[PDB]
Amino acid sequence: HHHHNRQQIDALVKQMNVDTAKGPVDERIQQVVVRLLGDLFQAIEDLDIQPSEVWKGLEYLTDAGQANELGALAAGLGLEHYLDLRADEADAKAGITGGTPRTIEGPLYVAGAPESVGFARMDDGSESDKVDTLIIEGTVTDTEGNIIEGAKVEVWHANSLGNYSFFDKSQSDFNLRRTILTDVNGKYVALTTMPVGYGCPPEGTTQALLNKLGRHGNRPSHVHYFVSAPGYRKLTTQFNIEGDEYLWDDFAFATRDGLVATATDVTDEAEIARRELDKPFKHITFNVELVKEAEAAPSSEVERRRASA
Amino acid sequence: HHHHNRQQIDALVKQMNVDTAKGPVDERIQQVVVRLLGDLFQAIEDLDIQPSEVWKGLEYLTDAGQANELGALAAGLGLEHYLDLRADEADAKAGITGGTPRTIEGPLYVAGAPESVGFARMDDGSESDKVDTLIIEGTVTDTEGNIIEGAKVEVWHANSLGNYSFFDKSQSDFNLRRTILTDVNGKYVALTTMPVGYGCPPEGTTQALLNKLGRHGNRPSHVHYFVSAPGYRKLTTQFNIEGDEYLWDDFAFATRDGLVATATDVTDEAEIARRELDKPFKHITFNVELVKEAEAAPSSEVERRRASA
Ligand SMILES: CCCCCCCC/C=C/CCCCCCCC(=O)O[C@H](COC(=O)CCCCCCCCCCCCCCC)COP(=O)([O-])O[C@@H]1[C@H](O)[C@H](O)[C@@H](O)[C@H](O)[C@H]1O
Numbered sequence: 220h221h222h223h224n225r226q227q228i229d230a231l232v233k234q235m236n237v238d239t240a241k242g243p244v245d246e247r248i249q250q251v252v253v254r255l256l257g258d259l260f261q262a263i264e265d266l267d268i269q270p271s272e273v274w275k276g277l278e279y280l281t282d283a284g285q286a287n288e289l290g291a292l293a294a295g296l297g298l299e300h301y302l303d304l305r306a307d308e309a310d311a312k313a314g315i316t317g318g319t320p321r322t323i324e325g326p327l328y329v330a331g332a333p334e335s336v337g338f339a340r341m342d343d344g345s346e347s348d349k350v351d352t353l354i355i356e357g358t359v360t361d362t363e364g365n366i367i368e369g370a371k372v373e374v375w376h377a378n379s380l381g382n383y384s385f386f387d388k389s390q391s392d393f394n395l396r397r398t399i400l401t402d403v404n405g406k407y408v409a410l411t412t413m414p415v416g417y418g419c420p421p422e423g424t425t426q427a428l429l430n431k432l433g434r435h436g437n438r439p440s441h442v443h444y445f446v447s448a449p450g451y452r453k454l455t456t457q458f459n460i461e462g463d464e465y466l467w468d469d470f471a472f473a474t475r476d477g478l479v480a481t482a483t484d485v486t487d488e489a490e491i492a493r494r495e496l497d498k499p500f501k502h503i504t505f506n507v508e509l510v511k512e513a514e515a516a517p518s519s520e521v522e523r524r525r526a527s528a
Numbered sequence: 529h530h531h532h533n534r535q536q537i538d539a540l541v542k543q544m545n546v547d548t549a550k551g552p553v554d555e556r557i558q559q560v561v562v563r564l565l566g567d568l569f570q571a572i573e574d575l576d577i578q579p580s581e582v583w584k585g586l587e588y589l590t591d592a593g594q595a596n597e598l599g600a601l602a603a604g605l606g607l608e609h610y611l612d613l614r615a616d617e618a619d620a621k622a623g624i625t626g627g628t629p630r631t632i633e634g635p636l637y638v639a640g641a642p643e644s645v646g647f648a649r650m651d652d653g654s655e656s657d658k659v660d661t662l663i664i665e666g667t668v669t670d671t672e673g674n675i676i677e678g679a680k681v682e683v684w685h686a687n688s689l690g691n692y693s694f695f696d697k698s699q700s701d702f703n704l705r706r707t708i709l710t711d712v713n714g715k716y717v718a719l720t721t722m723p724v725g726y727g728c729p730p731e732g733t734t735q736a737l738l739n740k741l742g743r744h745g746n747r748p749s750h751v752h753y754f755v756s757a758p759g760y761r762k763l764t765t766q767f768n769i770e771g772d773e774y775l776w777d778d779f780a781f782a783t784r785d786g787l788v789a790t791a792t793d794v795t796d797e798a799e800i801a802r803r804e805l806d807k808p809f810k811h812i813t814f815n816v817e818l819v820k821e822a823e824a825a826p827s828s829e830v831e832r833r834r835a836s837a
């Protein structure tokens with residue numbers, strides 16, 4: 220079933236997409252298109268992919284884009300994690316060491332969250348009778364432990380049902396999304412609720428493909444972070460919580476050593492009173508170490524389309 | 529910038545998408561996913577594709593799917609034509625010869641058009657003062673010239689502005705879309721209007737990428753055909769009209785020898801009266817030769833999602 224070799228494929232892709240050019244071309248877009256189309260044609264030949272198969276593939280991609288699920292598909296196939304593996308290797312070749320490890324953004328960041336200094340309450344209290352209270356705190360430092368004041372700590376996470384605000388229109392706008400600027404001691408504190416892990420929408424396109432692959436679409440509980448400061452490399456990270464069934468079986472492959480936190484239980488009446496609470500809560504420490512931005516450093520920032528509100 | 533070789537890539541794709549499988553897997557979908565993801569990761573390494581670039585690519589695909597333009601993109605990059613090049617080579621290796629040549633379907637077929645025997649008027653007359661009348665006629669035969677009665681001739685084409693019904697909601701439903709069953713003499717006749725060639729939606733995603741490639745998004749005038757009959761291989765084809773600026777410069781590469789027709793001019797008062805018209809018209813002959821369906825023959829039918837009404 221090999222009807223064309225790669226030479227013949229390359230000649231056809233050139234005739235159709237390069238020889239037809241008139242006037243100015245974006246050379247990078249041209250290069251990438253030619254490469255990816257040649258690779259697709261070769262895979263069609265090697266695997267003898269039939270026209271009905273190609274159309275099913277394109278229809279699936281159309282449906283995924285219509286459901287706004289291609290971000291989730293990038294995560295679940297491991298493409299998003301792969302970009303981080305490449306970034307870590309680039310940084311190693313640059314001699315960049317130290318710093319809290321990176322991991323994936325995921326597709327659910329929303330720009331425009333409430334900003335405050337040193338402290339934020341993340342939740343609206345609508346789940347207070349059905350989920351544990353969580354306090355998260357940490358210090359943001361450079362690699363020698365010097366505190367960083369005014370670092371921008373952006374956090375977002377799921378509610379007690381595994382749902383995120385903005386996407387879940389039942390939640391108040393920006394629920395469980397805050398920006399916290401570190402205080403004079405490099406500290407941030409968030410008063411919030413325990414996140415639960417979650418799966419892909421069960422009738423959606425991402426889970427439809429995972430089902431064909433025999434795979435689950437679940438993530439362990441986690442809290443997402445962007446951390447930035449003048450003079451420092453921007454960090455995209457998370458923590459995961461020890462004890463989760465899916466901790467080392469995340470469908471998006473985001474868990475790493477260095478990013479697992481233990482949720483401690485605080486039942487002590489004195490400490491509860493000190494925090495102005497009425498019941499036991501969970502506490503997580505998550506300190507963040509940022510690497511100073513050097514002239515030689517590859518960028519740690521990523522341009523990506525993100526929701527805003 | 530090579531951070532991973534293909535061995536390392538293959539091992540990662542396997543860890544993420546194969547080792548994670550539990551219970552039954554669709555082996556074909558698994559095979560194709562593993563191949564395409566490995567090829568994507570390798571192209572990312574070879575071309576040093578940055579995360580911002582990957583996200584732009586996925587955002588473009590999302591936007592294309594939302595605008596229902598991935599079919600048009602498949603046509604414009606030459607993927608749709610490439611499937612026909614493969615089908616023609618498969619048929620040659622099967623010893624299938626003769627028959628009117630195939631070409632691309634395009635993305636604008638709609639199922640459920642009015643059916644009639646031997647004759648159809650395709651247009652609603654709403655453009656009668658602004659476009660030329662066209663009569664199309666032909667005989668459908670086997671490869672030795674024997675007529676075929678009751679062959680299903682499905683035709684669709686653009687109006688005087690280059691727009692298709694269903695997609696252009698201003699047109700009456702099924703305007704310029706008919707199914708004509710061949711009569712006792714193997715004949716079909718369509719009374720219609722001259723199609724004009726057309727381009728991609730100028731502010732749409734397909735033209736946005738073509739612009740980066742320095743390419744136009746125009747097709748020459750044409751009329752699309754499905755032809756089918758019991759005992760015969762289904763045919764997807766078109767004719768193009770001689771004289772079109774874009775005849776041999778179609779952005780979808782669909783023009784072929786054997787499928788260019790000449791539009792003759794009929795100004796003769798006697799002939800005009802015979803056809804029950806009042807003014808000169810254009811006439812096209814387009815005969816169709818179908819190949820008999822043999823046990824050895826590869827399928828000439830393609831499963832594809834198509835609009836219906
Ligand atoms: C550009 C790539 C090349 C494309 C062009 C070449 C692609 C070639 C693909 C060959 C496919 C083999 C199919 C064999 C038989 C199919 C039978 C079938 O059941 O059809 C469908 C299966 O077809 C697929 O899902 C294939 C998609 C894989 C391609 C994308 C991954 C590529 C990886 C990397 C590239 C970068 C990709 C980017 C990474 C983010 C079933 O539908 P569905 O239940 O899976 O989803 C269903 C579904 O389809 C419903 O219609 C929908 O309503 C519902 O919501 C959804 O859940």
Ligand SMILES: CCCCCCCC/C=C/CCCCCCCC(=O)O[C@H](COC(=O)CCCCCCCCCCCCCCC)COP(=O)([O-])O[C@@H]1[C@H](O)[C@H](O)[C@@H](O)[C@H](O)[C@H]1O
Binds near residue numbers: 605
């Ligand atoms: C799965 C493939 C891998 C993907 C994952 C890997 C992809 C890697 C791609 C790298 C891209 C290089 C970009 C370099 C710099 C980008 C700058 C820029 O201006 O961004 C944009 C350019 O990015 C692209 O268009 C790249 C798309 C190519 C990928 C698809 C073809 C693959 C071929 C075969 C595979 C089968 C494909 C199937 C064939 C059908 C500009 O936006 P736009 O004006 O082109 O369109 C605009 C636009 O983007 C607007 O936002 C929108 O509103 C408007 O309508 C639209 O017109």
Ligand SMILES: [Fe+3]
Binds near residue numbers: 325327441443
């Ligand atoms: Fe998340």
Ligand SMILES: [Fe+3]
Binds near residue numbers: 750752
């Ligand atoms: Fe057309």
